[PDB]
Paper text:
Nevertheless, the tri-Asp site in [name] represents an unusual metal binding site that selectively and stoichiometrically binds certain multivalent cations. In the apoprotein structure the tri-Asp site is pre-formed to receive a metal ion by a hydrogen bond network consisting of Asp231, Arg228, Gly207, and several water molecules filling the site. Notably, the arginine residues form a positively charged ring around the tri-Asp site, limiting the metal-Asp interactions along the three-fold symmetry axis and likely responsible for only one metal ion being captured by these residues. We observed binding to the tri-Asp site for Ca2+, Mn2+, both Fe2+ and Fe3+, Co2+, Ni2+, Cu2+, Zn2+, and Cd2+, whereas Mg2+, K+, Cr3+, Cu+ and Cs+ did not bind at that location (data not shown).
In all cases, the Asp231 side chains bind the metals with bidentate coordination, with a seventh site always showing extra density that we modelled as a water molecule. Even in the case of the low resolution Co2+ bound dataset this extra density is observed. As 3.55 Å dataset resolution cannot justify placement of water alone we inferred the shown mode based on the observations in the other datasets. In general, soaking experiments reduced diffraction power and had a negative effect on merging statistics; especially the Cu and Co datasets were of worse quality than the apoprotein datasets or those for other metals like Ca. Several metal soaks (Co, Ni, Zn, and Cd) also resulted in binding of these metals to surface exposed residues. These partially disordered sites only appeared after metal soaks, showing a significant electron density peak and in some cases anomalous peaks. In most cases the surface site involved only a single histidine residue. This resulted in higher B-factors of these metals compared to the tri-Asp site. For small molecule complexes in the Cambridge Structural Database (CSD) the most common and second most frequent coordination numbers for Mn2+, Fe2+/3+, Co2+, Ni2+, Zn2+, and Cd2+ are 6 and 4; while for Ca2+ they are 6 and 7; and for Cu2+ they are 5 and 635. We reason that the tri-Asp site captures low levels of contaminating metal ions, most likely Ni, Co, or Cd, from the Superdex 200 resin used for other protein purifications in the laboratory.
Residue numbers in the entry:
A (entry chain A): 3 to 124, 134 to 171, 176 to 258
B (entry chain C): 2 to 126, 136 to 259
C (entry chain B): 2 to 127, 141 to 259
D (entry chain F): 2 to 127, 137 to 260
E (entry chain E): 10 to 123, 148 to 258
F (entry chain D): 3 to 125, 144 to 259
Write the structure that this text describes.
């Protein structure tokens, strides 16, 4: 029932008349913002892209114009995830208390602009369930093979991780050492390794590279060491296991 | 004539047949045919067929299913046992023929059982195609790669499997009997080396010796995987896992 | 503003120009201009021009001829005498002026001889005998890739070529022999799998500038690059420990 | 002035002491002292002592036993639990002091229980030593690093454990409690890396992180062992095995 | 205890090959029995290198021994020429039967070899070799050429010399520890795994050279030595 | 045999009674200095170590101490090779007028202290080479005499780093000399920094270039600070 899953999907869209969509630039939320724009109009849809200290200023700037390209009045809001004790200390369920802090902000924008629901692209209770979010994609049994299909069906051609992963569970995130990691990875991205993570270990940086790249990386050893040392690490290391 | 002449000459035969079945691969030729047939005849008069066999990679097979689902074509999968044919099993210089002959003979059955007037494929400007009643609709309109790349870009086609991996028989010397076992022995080795970050690789079969052909630029990057590839391909049945000092061919 | 807006400003200026001549080189920026001009003014109001010269590789020229015909453009090939200018042959800091003047003035002649309102080229933010129509719409390097993805453009020269005169010191006169000596050296290295490379000329010494990421991969070709470039006239073939600039 | 005048001063104190106990550490300086004591006093009035402990490798210890037996000395080994010292177990910046103090304090027991006039060591002309009394006979005769090599060639001394090893406590940060487990955790890592062909290496301890210091010339050759060094040192208890991008003693 | 067995024999014959074992044995027999009461034999064969012969000949004259060389045709043995896994048996017999003849013709009480009767270890032989002043010895592993060939591959002067030639070349490039494995048209290079990084630059040269020696494919064993 | 080459060596050594040795710290001149001191005594052997612009002040200070360690009456002499016009311009025959400037000093020192000859190592008498001494034997006798320290770095004359006909100066010599010890410091004892005005050409054994990859950026900055505009690695390696 292929076009009958679009039928279940479109059915809920007309029910809400006006929505606020949580835009993440990914293929799923790009599919949601487009379907909301083609069914409810540009004025009954408010796209929101969350900016934070945990995402690269390029990753946020990418999704804002990607929302403008679909022609939706997109609003960017900023979140201090570090304000949550669960996040600042980085517990293993920190993504939950993060996804919760998000939707309540989206629920504010939805309530302040007259939205029937908040839409998105899909420890305690569920993060959406608690905030009253509507994940219309999963409610209609979308698969990985369906979303990629409908994006081509709608003419979608352009579509695009969080820094808490660079830190161990239970290592206090600070405004200082995040920029210490964020700046370190931007350096290694510039040196010719777009896929890299700089793992935090207090006074030790642990550099994970794809093992194919470890050979090409050899020449930058002294320079990466000296640069990341200036950024505050006492020891700059390469994880012998790679990424 | 012009690129505009060739687009209409291409569509001319498309409407002539009303309902078609495309032999879909990941390349631009079969993708341009699948897209143009879908843009002219609709998904209901277009059935894409992706051939599975012991001779081609399951990663390339699963890829062509998705390019047909992403292009919006009612895609059907058929499976081929090339090894049942004596000419293929022995790996003769004409093994590609009896493989291509066994292939097109299958699609004309699928064409007759789904109501197709012809079978389309991506031949542009060998005999086995012109024997089973197969239309090379691109070649019928004098399409060149400069025309196929031009018209595919015009339709917005940017995504296609560029790695048109040769037939796995190429990993074997001429006259080395292909078996269900040693064919999978090659596929597993190459899939591993492809998984490690080297998309261009061939594992040549030489009885108890594996010969790895890698581009010479990449051998610097490959140093780190030495111990693992040896032990891995040894587990896959080779007594010796070696790197060809000469690189790719 | 949005990418949706910069596209309007582009077509807006194109309708104002009605008929144009695009200076096609093969890079992603000039590829975007040739396609947008054909999709706004048609095949008959767009003349693509690919300039051949001694300072650029006969391979980079052939790419832009086929890439222009592949986009469906009336492609014209012109041949240029950069060395015919005294200021360039001796390789002074003024080579860029008298080279670009000869280029734009050659195309400005085609413009009057092919009936174009202007000559267009691919210049982005970050001479004026021609219109840089992308910078007028404030396109950046990240936006050109964005509009190229929207239009389906897949063939473009991924390594931006450059004038061969940079390989020689300022004030070392270029000759047809030492020019080809460098070009042939780079063409060999290009064939081995290093598309971004420069062979810097220092008389009997070749200085190879390679991206520092690649130098590890390059170890295996050492003896061959030496032996080939030695046969091409260099007494010493060396790798610059500093890499590409 | 010359060497042959210091070799005089060296022999002078040796006959003066009649019977001595030498602290042999396999190094070039301690090899010269044990040899000169055997040639001046005879084998029966000289006892060489080589300490086995948790701070030096069970592999490096056995060699100094072979160098002492090969020089023709009655070598007796004593074992010390440095961790029994409150200051060493915590690895304070002064742990070297209370460690060398525990060293000389043991030797003076062996010297008093076998009848020696002094304790000898190879300290030469290059702070807890003499508060137990050990005499630096080479340094007392103004021997230099070039003088020890000169007199060793004169005596036919050619074999010595040139890589004078360091104490395994240097592999740990200041203020990291040493345990019988994590000391062997480092020692086993270093012994593996030595076995693969990198004789000069240190494995720095950082809890769940091993930090591998290799000579930066060697890092190119080391790539092929990446996965094997990682997994072996992981089985030795480390969660993450890393190579210090700054190399040896960064 | 070591010298003790030497005095028992009055006159002995030491088998010098070039390794540290035969170097330590030949010297100690001379220091206990004198230069005239020790007869050294160094084996010449189709299975050994012209340098290993020169290695033991130069080392025996330097240690002060009356060195005698005999030559053996191992390929003449049916088990070796086809090289079955028991060729080492048919190989070891042709050697020892030759030495038992020479011992009677030089007035020797025994024939010596690399040693095991005195519980010498690899760490112990190195101790007496430095103690006895031995500084010249074949530091490169001397070995029989049959190991480069699979069990059951007919050895010929052409394909044996085909293998032997590759190893001397690679040893010249700066890799003294190397074996070149024969597989008809495939050469398999065993190199110490640390060196494979250093070996990278010689790839094309080793390939082109070893192709000239008759191999269709020159390969590096990913597992090394 | 070998034990003959030593008795033949002493035979020629006593025939000369008193000698002057050209010590260059290498093992060969070390074997000569030990055997001559052990046959004639410290008072009948004068070791001479040459200081000049063409060898490193580090190789000189090392060779001085190696003579004092073997117990030899060591005298230091200074040579002005750059004062020789044939050397300063580095002509293809500059090697000749250099070897003559060297031995002419040593033949003077021999006569002013009463030496019968000037001695040197190889394979002015050359007693080692005169006795059919080989490279495998010289290392053997060094262990026999108890010799363990010797400069296994036969640092050739620095004139080879400059093309023929490039005037050597005290300044550009130090530009080359300092560049090489830096490269020696990183772990490559066999290396040459070839001078080409604003280009340095680094010769490394092709085996070592794999080991060399990581130091690329650092070698550039140091040698650039030392005056080279471009620091390069010779793709052809050593020789
Ligand atoms: Co805060
Ligand atoms: Co079957
Ligand atoms: Co690479
Ligand atoms: Co205890
Ligand atoms: Co002067
Ligand atoms: Co190396």
């Amino acid at each position: 029932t292929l076009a009958t899953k679009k039928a279940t999907l479109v059915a809920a869209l007309k029910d809400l008349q006006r929505v606020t969509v949580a835009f993440s630039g990914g293929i799923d939320s790009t599919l949601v913002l487009k379907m909301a724009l083609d069914v409810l109009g540009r004025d009954n849809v408010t796209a929101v892209v969350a900016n934070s200290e945990l995402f690269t200023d390029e990753e946020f700037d990418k999704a804002m114009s990607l929302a403008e390209e679909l022609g939706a009045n997109v609003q960017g809001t900023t979140l201090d995830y570090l304000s949550d004790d669960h996040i600042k200390n980085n517990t293993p369920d920190s993504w939950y208390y993060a996804k919760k802090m998000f939707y309540s902000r989206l629920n504010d924008i939805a309530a302040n602009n007259g939205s029937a629901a908040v839409l998105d692209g899909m420890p305690g209770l569920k993060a959406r369930s608690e905030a009253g979010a509507r994940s219309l994609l999963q409610e209609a049994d979308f698969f990985k093979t369906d979303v990629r299909a409908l994006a081509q069906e709608l003419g979608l051609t352009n579509w695009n991780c969080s820094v808490s992963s660079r830190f161990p569970y239970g290592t206090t995130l600070t405004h200082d050492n995040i920029a210490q990691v964020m700046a370190a990875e931007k350096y290694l991205r510039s040196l010719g390794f777009p896929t890299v993570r700089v793992r935090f270990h207090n006074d030790i940086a642990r550099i994970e590279l794809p093992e194919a790249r470890i050979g090409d990386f050899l020449v930058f050893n002294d320079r990466v060491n000296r640069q990341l040392q200036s950024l505050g690490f006492r020891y700059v290391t390469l994880d012998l296991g790679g990424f």
